[PDB]
Design an enzyme around this catalytic site. Structure first.
Site, PDB file in Angstrom:
ATOM      1  CG  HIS A 148      32.962  39.107 103.415  1.00  0.00           C
ATOM      2  ND1 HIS A 148      34.075  38.380 103.771  1.00  0.00           N
ATOM      3  CD2 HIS A 148      32.820  38.942 102.077  1.00  0.00           C
ATOM      4  CE1 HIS A 148      34.575  37.784 102.702  1.00  0.00           C
ATOM      5  NE2 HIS A 148      33.835  38.115 101.659  1.00  0.00           N
ATOM      6  CG  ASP A 154      34.914  37.821 107.077  1.00  0.00           C
ATOM      7  OD1 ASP A 154      33.669  37.738 107.156  1.00  0.00           O
ATOM      8  OD2 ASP A 154      35.520  37.931 105.973  1.00  0.00           O
ATOM      9  N   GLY A 165      34.289  35.636  94.879  1.00  0.00           N
ATOM     10  CA  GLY A 165      33.487  34.459  94.575  1.00  0.00           C
ATOM     11  C   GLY A 165      33.924  33.233  95.362  1.00  0.00           C
ATOM     12  CB  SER A 198      33.992  35.536  99.768  1.00  0.00           C
ATOM     13  OG  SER A 198      34.904  36.582  99.447  1.00  0.00           O
ATOM     14  N   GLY A 199      34.285  32.945 101.897  1.00  0.00           N
ATOM     15  CA  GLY A 199      33.526  32.082 102.801  1.00  0.00           C
ATOM     16  C   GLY A 199      33.932  30.629 102.674  1.00  0.00           C
TER      17      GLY A 199
HETATM   18  N1  LIG Z   1      42.745  36.027  98.479  1.00  0.00           N
HETATM   19  C1  LIG Z   1      42.375  37.181  97.932  1.00  0.00           C
HETATM   20  N2  LIG Z   1      43.236  37.931  97.371  1.00  0.00           N
HETATM   21  C2  LIG Z   1      40.920  37.545  98.042  1.00  0.00           C
HETATM   22  C3  LIG Z   1      40.164  36.853  98.986  1.00  0.00           C
HETATM   23  C4  LIG Z   1      38.814  37.116  99.163  1.00  0.00           C
HETATM   24  C5  LIG Z   1      38.205  38.083  98.385  1.00  0.00           C
HETATM   25  C6  LIG Z   1      36.767  38.332  98.623  1.00  0.00           C
HETATM   26  N3  LIG Z   1      36.141  39.344  98.195  1.00  0.00           N
HETATM   27  O1  LIG Z   1      34.814  39.487  98.482  1.00  0.00           O
HETATM   28  C7  LIG Z   1      33.932  39.826  97.427  1.00  0.00           C
HETATM   29  C8  LIG Z   1      33.468  38.562  96.764  1.00  0.00           C
HETATM   30  O2  LIG Z   1      33.935  37.472  97.086  1.00  0.00           O
HETATM   31  O3  LIG Z   1      32.537  38.640  95.816  1.00  0.00           O
HETATM   32  C9  LIG Z   1      38.947  38.784  97.430  1.00  0.00           C
HETATM   33  C10 LIG Z   1      40.314  38.519  97.256  1.00  0.00           C
END
Ligand SMILES: N=C(N)c1ccc(/C=N/OCC(=O)O)cc1
Ligand SMILES: [Ca+2]
Length: 223
Positions: A40, A84, A175, A177-178
Protein backbone atom coordinates in the site's frame (compact mmCIF):
# COMPACT_ATOMS: atom_id res chain seq x y z
CA UNK A 1 4.19 5.80 16.55
CA UNK A 2 1.82 6.69 19.38
CA UNK A 3 2.96 6.25 23.00
CA UNK A 4 6.48 5.11 22.12
CA UNK A 5 9.94 6.50 22.71
CA UNK A 6 12.79 8.20 20.89
CA UNK A 7 14.83 5.28 19.49
CA UNK A 8 18.25 6.95 19.63
CA UNK A 9 20.19 7.85 16.47
CA UNK A 10 20.96 4.89 14.20
CA UNK A 11 19.94 2.27 16.81
CA UNK A 12 17.52 0.83 14.21
CA UNK A 13 20.01 0.69 11.32
CA UNK A 14 17.70 -1.36 9.05
CA UNK A 15 14.94 1.30 9.22
CA UNK A 16 14.49 3.24 5.98
CA UNK A 17 12.35 6.21 4.93
CA UNK A 18 10.67 6.14 1.53
CA UNK A 19 10.65 9.64 0.02
CA UNK A 20 8.74 11.01 -2.99
CA UNK A 21 9.51 14.67 -2.31
CA UNK A 22 8.48 14.02 1.32
CA UNK A 23 8.56 11.06 3.73
CA UNK A 24 5.52 8.86 3.09
CA UNK A 25 6.32 5.35 4.38
CA UNK A 26 8.85 3.25 6.20
CA UNK A 27 10.69 0.16 5.01
CA UNK A 28 13.27 -2.42 6.11
CA UNK A 29 16.68 -3.03 4.53
CA UNK A 30 17.08 -6.79 4.04
CA UNK A 31 20.38 -6.73 2.13
CA UNK A 32 22.58 -4.12 0.42
CA UNK A 33 20.22 -3.90 -2.57
CA UNK A 34 16.68 -4.62 -1.32
CA UNK A 35 14.05 -3.07 0.94
CA UNK A 36 10.87 -4.71 2.19
CA UNK A 37 7.86 -2.40 2.62
CA UNK A 38 4.02 -2.49 2.37
CA UNK A 39 2.36 -2.84 -1.03
CA UNK A 40 0.00 0.00 0.00
CA UNK A 41 3.13 2.20 0.04
CA UNK A 42 3.64 1.62 -3.69
CA UNK A 43 4.26 4.65 -5.89
CA UNK A 44 6.59 5.64 -8.71
CA UNK A 45 9.70 7.79 -8.16
CA UNK A 46 10.70 6.42 -4.76
CA UNK A 47 13.97 7.48 -3.22
CA UNK A 48 15.16 5.26 -0.36
CA UNK A 49 16.83 7.08 2.57
CA UNK A 50 19.09 5.04 4.83
CA UNK A 51 20.95 5.95 7.98
CA UNK A 52 18.26 8.51 8.95
CA UNK A 53 17.47 9.81 12.39
CA UNK A 54 16.05 13.30 11.97
CA UNK A 55 14.26 13.00 8.60
CA UNK A 56 14.28 16.79 8.08
CA UNK A 57 18.02 17.37 8.66
CA UNK A 58 21.03 15.95 6.86
CA UNK A 59 23.14 14.86 9.86
CA UNK A 60 25.97 13.12 7.99
CA UNK A 61 25.24 9.39 8.10
CA UNK A 62 22.55 9.22 5.43
CA UNK A 63 22.60 7.40 2.13
CA UNK A 64 19.98 8.50 -0.39
CA UNK A 65 19.46 5.92 -3.17
CA UNK A 66 16.79 5.92 -5.88
CA UNK A 67 14.68 2.83 -6.37
CA UNK A 68 15.31 1.07 -9.71
CA UNK A 69 12.27 -1.22 -9.42
CA UNK A 70 9.31 -1.92 -7.15
CA UNK A 71 7.61 -5.31 -7.00
CA UNK A 72 4.21 -5.52 -5.38
CA UNK A 73 3.20 -8.98 -4.18
CA UNK A 74 1.32 -10.75 -7.05
CA UNK A 75 -1.69 -11.42 -4.75
CA UNK A 76 -1.85 -8.02 -3.05
CA UNK A 77 -5.47 -6.96 -2.60
CA UNK A 78 -5.68 -3.23 -1.82
CA UNK A 79 -9.29 -3.54 -0.54
CA UNK A 80 -8.62 -6.19 2.16
CA UNK A 81 -4.85 -5.45 2.48
CA UNK A 82 -4.23 -9.18 2.16
CA UNK A 83 -0.56 -9.78 1.10
CA UNK A 84 0.40 -6.18 1.93
CA UNK A 85 4.10 -6.52 1.02
CA UNK A 86 6.38 -5.15 -1.67
CA UNK A 87 10.07 -5.29 -2.55
CA UNK A 88 12.05 -2.23 -3.63
CA UNK A 89 15.38 -2.63 -5.39
CA UNK A 90 18.01 0.08 -4.95
CA UNK A 91 19.70 1.35 -8.11
CA UNK A 92 23.07 1.01 -6.37
CA UNK A 93 24.08 -1.10 -3.36
CA UNK A 94 24.06 0.58 0.04
CA UNK A 95 27.33 0.71 1.93
CA UNK A 96 26.70 -1.38 5.04
CA UNK A 97 28.14 -0.10 8.35
CA UNK A 98 27.10 0.49 12.00
CA UNK A 99 24.42 2.99 10.99
CA UNK A 100 23.17 1.20 7.89
CA UNK A 101 22.63 -2.53 8.26
CA UNK A 102 20.32 -5.26 7.01
CA UNK A 103 17.79 -7.14 9.13
CA UNK A 104 17.41 -10.93 8.86
CA UNK A 105 14.38 -12.60 7.33
CA UNK A 106 12.77 -15.17 9.61
CA UNK A 107 13.18 -18.94 9.27
CA UNK A 108 10.12 -19.47 11.45
CA UNK A 109 7.05 -17.41 12.40
CA UNK A 110 7.03 -15.44 15.64
CA UNK A 111 5.12 -16.49 18.75
CA UNK A 112 2.08 -14.92 20.43
CA UNK A 113 3.26 -12.93 23.45
CA UNK A 114 6.70 -12.10 21.99
CA UNK A 115 7.68 -8.46 22.44
CA UNK A 116 8.65 -6.88 19.11
CA UNK A 117 10.20 -3.54 18.16
CA UNK A 118 8.07 -1.34 15.84
CA UNK A 119 9.56 1.88 14.50
CA UNK A 120 8.82 4.84 12.28
CA UNK A 121 8.35 8.55 11.65
CA UNK A 122 4.53 8.39 11.67
CA UNK A 123 1.92 10.35 13.62
CA UNK A 124 2.49 10.41 17.38
CA UNK A 125 -1.10 11.34 18.36
CA UNK A 126 -4.09 8.97 18.61
CA UNK A 127 -6.32 12.01 18.07
CA UNK A 128 -5.02 14.96 16.11
CA UNK A 129 -1.80 15.16 14.11
CA UNK A 130 1.85 15.56 15.10
CA UNK A 131 4.80 14.17 13.18
CA UNK A 132 8.16 13.70 14.87
CA UNK A 133 11.54 14.73 13.54
CA UNK A 134 13.46 11.77 14.91
CA UNK A 135 12.77 8.05 14.64
CA UNK A 136 10.33 6.70 17.23
CA UNK A 137 10.12 3.17 18.59
CA UNK A 138 7.56 1.01 20.39
CA UNK A 139 7.89 -2.33 22.17
CA UNK A 140 4.65 -4.27 21.61
CA UNK A 141 3.62 -7.92 22.04
CA UNK A 142 2.16 -10.14 19.36
CA UNK A 143 -1.52 -10.83 20.23
CA UNK A 144 -3.24 -14.20 19.97
CA UNK A 145 -4.91 -14.87 16.65
CA UNK A 146 -8.29 -15.20 18.42
CA UNK A 147 -7.98 -11.76 20.07
CA UNK A 148 -6.88 -10.34 16.68
CA UNK A 149 -9.89 -11.85 14.88
CA UNK A 150 -12.20 -10.70 17.71
CA UNK A 151 -10.88 -7.14 17.36
CA UNK A 152 -11.44 -7.14 13.59
CA UNK A 153 -14.19 -9.65 12.79
CA UNK A 154 -14.17 -10.79 9.17
CA UNK A 155 -10.94 -8.94 8.28
CA UNK A 156 -7.94 -10.93 9.54
CA UNK A 157 -6.33 -13.40 7.12
CA UNK A 158 -3.61 -15.98 7.79
CA UNK A 159 -1.21 -13.36 6.29
CA UNK A 160 -1.82 -10.86 9.10
CA UNK A 161 -1.15 -10.65 12.81
CA UNK A 162 -2.05 -8.19 15.54
CA UNK A 163 0.44 -6.60 17.93
CA UNK A 164 0.00 -3.96 20.58
CA UNK A 165 -2.27 -3.23 23.51
CA UNK A 166 -6.02 -3.76 23.63
CA UNK A 167 -6.32 -0.97 26.25
CA UNK A 168 -5.08 1.50 23.58
CA UNK A 169 -2.54 4.29 24.03
CA UNK A 170 0.38 2.58 22.22
CA UNK A 171 0.45 1.72 18.52
CA UNK A 172 1.91 2.36 15.09
CA UNK A 173 0.06 5.00 13.00
CA UNK A 174 -0.16 6.75 9.61
CA UNK A 175 3.33 7.50 8.30
CA UNK A 176 4.72 4.30 9.94
CA UNK A 177 3.25 2.20 7.10
CA UNK A 178 5.71 -0.23 5.49
CA UNK A 179 8.10 -0.06 8.41
CA UNK A 180 9.56 -2.94 10.47
CA UNK A 181 8.18 -5.17 13.19
CA UNK A 182 11.32 -7.00 14.44
CA UNK A 183 10.95 -9.88 16.92
CA UNK A 184 13.97 -11.76 18.28
CA UNK A 185 16.22 -10.09 15.71
CA UNK A 186 14.15 -11.10 12.61
CA UNK A 187 11.80 -9.06 10.40
CA UNK A 188 8.45 -10.63 11.35
CA UNK A 189 5.96 -7.93 10.39
CA UNK A 190 5.33 -4.84 8.27
CA UNK A 191 3.21 -1.91 9.51
CA UNK A 192 0.02 -2.48 7.47
CA UNK A 193 -3.29 -1.24 8.92
CA UNK A 194 -5.59 -0.63 11.91
CA UNK A 195 -8.74 1.26 12.83
CA UNK A 196 -7.25 4.66 13.67
CA UNK A 197 -4.20 4.49 15.97
CA UNK A 198 -3.88 3.48 19.65
CA UNK A 199 -7.64 3.07 19.93
CA UNK A 200 -9.09 0.77 22.58
CA UNK A 201 -9.72 -2.75 21.20
CA UNK A 202 -8.17 -1.82 17.85
CA UNK A 203 -4.54 -3.04 17.86
CA UNK A 204 -2.15 -2.68 14.94
CA UNK A 205 -2.42 -5.21 12.09
CA UNK A 206 0.81 -6.35 10.46
CA UNK A 207 1.81 -8.28 7.34
CA UNK A 208 3.01 -11.76 8.39
CA UNK A 209 6.50 -11.74 6.79
CA UNK A 210 7.30 -15.41 7.60
CA UNK A 211 4.69 -16.39 4.97
CA UNK A 212 6.61 -14.53 2.22
CA UNK A 213 10.21 -15.70 2.65
CA UNK A 214 10.06 -18.04 -0.39
CA UNK A 215 8.60 -15.30 -2.59
CA UNK A 216 11.16 -12.79 -1.33
CA UNK A 217 14.08 -15.13 -1.98
CA UNK A 218 12.80 -16.15 -5.42
CA UNK A 219 12.13 -12.56 -6.40
CA UNK A 220 15.52 -11.22 -5.35
CA UNK A 221 17.26 -14.15 -7.07
CA UNK A 222 15.72 -13.03 -10.37
CA UNK A 223 15.66 -9.25 -10.29
N1 LIG B 1 -1.34 0.34 13.81
C1 LIG B 1 -2.30 1.14 13.36
N2 LIG B 1 -3.32 1.39 14.08
C2 LIG B 1 -2.12 1.71 11.98
C3 LIG B 1 -1.19 1.08 11.16
C4 LIG B 1 -0.95 1.52 9.86
C5 LIG B 1 -1.65 2.61 9.38
C6 LIG B 1 -1.37 3.03 7.99
N3 LIG B 1 -2.10 3.82 7.33
O1 LIG B 1 -1.76 4.14 6.04
C7 LIG B 1 -1.78 5.50 5.66
C8 LIG B 1 -0.45 6.11 5.98
O2 LIG B 1 0.41 5.48 6.58
O3 LIG B 1 -0.21 7.36 5.59
C9 LIG B 1 -2.59 3.25 10.19
C10 LIG B 1 -2.83 2.80 11.50
CA1 LIG C 1 18.70 13.07 8.43
Amino acid sequence: IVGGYTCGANTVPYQVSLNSGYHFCGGSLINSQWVVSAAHCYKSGIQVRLGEDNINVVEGNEQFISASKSIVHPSYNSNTLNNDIMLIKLKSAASLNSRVASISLPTSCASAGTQCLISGWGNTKSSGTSYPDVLKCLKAPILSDSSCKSAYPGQITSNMFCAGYLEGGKDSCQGDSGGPVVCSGKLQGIVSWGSGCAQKNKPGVYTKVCNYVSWIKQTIASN
